[PDB]
Each structure stands twice: as structure tokens, then as C-alpha cells.
Design a protein around this motif. Sequence first.
Motif, PDB file in Angstrom:
ATOM      1  N   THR A  53       0.814  -1.229   0.000  1.00  7.67           N
ATOM      2  CA  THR A  53       0.000   0.000   0.000  1.00  7.67           C
ATOM      3  C   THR A  53       0.844   1.274   0.000  1.00  7.67           C
ATOM      4  N   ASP A  88     -16.127 -11.709  -2.016  1.00  4.14           N
ATOM      5  CA  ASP A  88     -15.625 -10.631  -2.850  1.00  4.14           C
ATOM      6  C   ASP A  88     -14.723 -11.255  -3.925  1.00  4.14           C
ATOM      7  N   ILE A  91     -10.880 -10.247  -4.698  1.00  4.51           N
ATOM      8  CA  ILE A  91      -9.750 -10.604  -3.855  1.00  4.51           C
ATOM      9  C   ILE A  91      -9.111 -11.883  -4.396  1.00  4.51           C
ATOM     10  N   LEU A 122      -4.991  -6.148  -1.279  1.00  2.00           N
ATOM     11  CA  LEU A 122      -6.313  -6.734  -1.076  1.00  2.00           C
ATOM     12  C   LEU A 122      -6.189  -8.215  -0.821  1.00  2.00           C
ATOM     13  N   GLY A 126      -7.400  -9.644   2.616  1.00  2.00           N
ATOM     14  CA  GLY A 126      -8.579 -10.499   2.477  1.00  2.00           C
ATOM     15  C   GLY A 126      -8.356 -12.002   2.640  1.00  2.00           C
ATOM     16  N   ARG A 140     -11.472  -5.552   7.152  1.00  2.00           N
ATOM     17  CA  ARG A 140     -12.545  -4.940   6.362  1.00  2.00           C
ATOM     18  C   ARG A 140     -12.428  -3.418   6.248  1.00  2.00           C
ATOM     19  N   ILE A 143      -9.426  -2.882   3.896  1.00  2.00           N
ATOM     20  CA  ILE A 143      -9.852  -3.218   2.542  1.00  2.00           C
ATOM     21  C   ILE A 143     -10.630  -2.056   1.931  1.00  2.00           C
ATOM     22  N   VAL A 146      -8.280   0.542   0.922  1.00  2.00           N
ATOM     23  CA  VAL A 146      -7.585   0.173  -0.306  1.00  2.00           C
ATOM     24  C   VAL A 146      -8.448   0.471  -1.526  1.00  2.00           C
ATOM     25  N   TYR A 147      -9.745   0.188  -1.424  1.00  2.00           N
ATOM     26  CA  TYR A 147     -10.656   0.429  -2.545  1.00  2.00           C
ATOM     27  C   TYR A 147     -10.770   1.920  -2.840  1.00  2.00           C
ATOM     28  N   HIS A 166     -15.092   0.995  -7.590  1.00  2.00           N
ATOM     29  CA  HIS A 166     -14.266   0.780  -6.393  1.00  2.00           C
ATOM     30  C   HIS A 166     -14.696   1.608  -5.195  1.00  2.00           C
ATOM     31  N   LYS A 169     -17.483  -0.230  -3.767  1.00  2.00           N
ATOM     32  CA  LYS A 169     -16.989  -1.389  -3.021  1.00  2.00           C
ATOM     33  C   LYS A 169     -16.485  -0.959  -1.648  1.00  2.00           C
ATOM     34  N   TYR A 173     -17.826  -1.993   2.221  1.00  4.63           N
ATOM     35  CA  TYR A 173     -16.979  -2.506   3.296  1.00  4.63           C
ATOM     36  C   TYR A 173     -17.137  -1.687   4.573  1.00  4.63           C
TER      37      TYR A 173
END
Length: 254
Positions: A53, A88, A91, A122, A126, A140, A143, A146-147, A166, A169, A173
Amino acid sequence: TSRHKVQIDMERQVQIAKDLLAQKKFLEAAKRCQQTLDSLPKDGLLPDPELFTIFAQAVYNMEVQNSKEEERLALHELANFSPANEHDDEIEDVSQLRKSGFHIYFENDLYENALDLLAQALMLLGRPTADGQSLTENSRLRIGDVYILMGDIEREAEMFSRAIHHYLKALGYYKTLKPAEQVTEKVIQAEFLVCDALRWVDQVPAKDKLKRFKHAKALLEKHMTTRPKDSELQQARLAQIQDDIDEVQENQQH
């Protein structure tokens, strides 16, 4: 063991890379992640998702400074406000994790590179845990984060349909999270980012745009009645959403 020595070294490198990113030393934070990743042993130790990341952020910001189809937005996704369910499909299995050659992410398309690094974040976040239980609150949350980053990059790269997908998404989450002030901030942020990307997507009908904008307006209006800490930011967002509505009502709809 070696495993512990490697673990401790990796944690220090993440902190250094994190600090370098905080200092806006992007090439340096990225190199730090890349070289740490290249030298980890290839068997029996999952790397820290923060290496991916931080690396992704670093390389994304380098490009800024230098300037399957389920990933695309489906119209029906805008009418969904449910939390993210147990599964998901985006992932990937941890078997597809890069083990070497991380210098590749300084080459060619840096936006693409950052996104691939996040796909692996992810994957790691995940990963189903051995205890058979479901993903933790922390996982979660991360995640979702990240999205949002994936969305931001895709937005910057003018892939607005992928961006919006995204952001939606991420929003799903955050909605699995135990209610809290910080959770509410992220939900609101994700709703606004959806709208901001949505104004640029040509292939969503005006009517669908308007319904999502009005949904987000109502949500932010309700939030404002709680007199939140950063009311000026929320007021700015709300003003922009009204501009989005105006733009579509006047130009796009008829």
C-alpha cells in the motif's frame, strides 16, 4: 529463527517507508518497499500488506508529480446501498502474489503499477484466516481504504467507471463496520467520491446520476444537522453535489 529476524526487519522497513511517504519522499519510500520486498524469502512468510500500500501510494504520487469487466460500473450498482457480503470475487488467491522482480513497478505505466500493488494488498488483507472465522473489523476497514485508493488512482487515470465501482466497493466494506464517528466519516467520504467521479462518466444515464446525487445530498444534509467537526468540508461537498445536480438537470437530461 530466521523468520522472526526477517519479521522484525520488515516491520522496521514499513515504518521507515511510512515515514518517508509522510515526508513526501516518494521515490525513496517506493524504493524502500521494493528492495524490502525483493529480499524477503520466497517461502513461508506473508509480507506486510503495508509494503504494497505504501509502495502503491509512493508510485502513484510520483506519476502525479510527473504531470474482468466486472470491474466496470454496472448501472444497477448505483441503486445498491447494502453492506458488502461475505464474498468478494476481486480478492485474488495469495498464490498469485509477486515474489520477486518488484523493480518492474518503476517501469512503464505507474498508475497501472500502483493498482497491481493494491490488488496484492487486497489479496493479503482479504486472505481467509486459519481459525475459520470471517474477516476482522480491522481487515474490512483496511480493505475499504484500499478500494478508496484504487478509486482515487483510477479517477486520476481517467478510468471513471472503474473508479466509481471501487468507491462503491469501499462504501460496502465500511457499512459492515460497527457504527462509530470515524466509520461515519468514511461512509460520507465514499458517498461523495462516488458522486464526484459520477459527474465525469458519460455512459450513466442522467436519471441514474440524479438519483445517486440526491441520495448523497440527503445523507450529507442529515450529517450536517449533527454539527460535525469539519462542517466546512462537509458544506463544500454538499455545495459540489448541488453543482452536480444542476449540471445534469440543465445539460445532460434533456
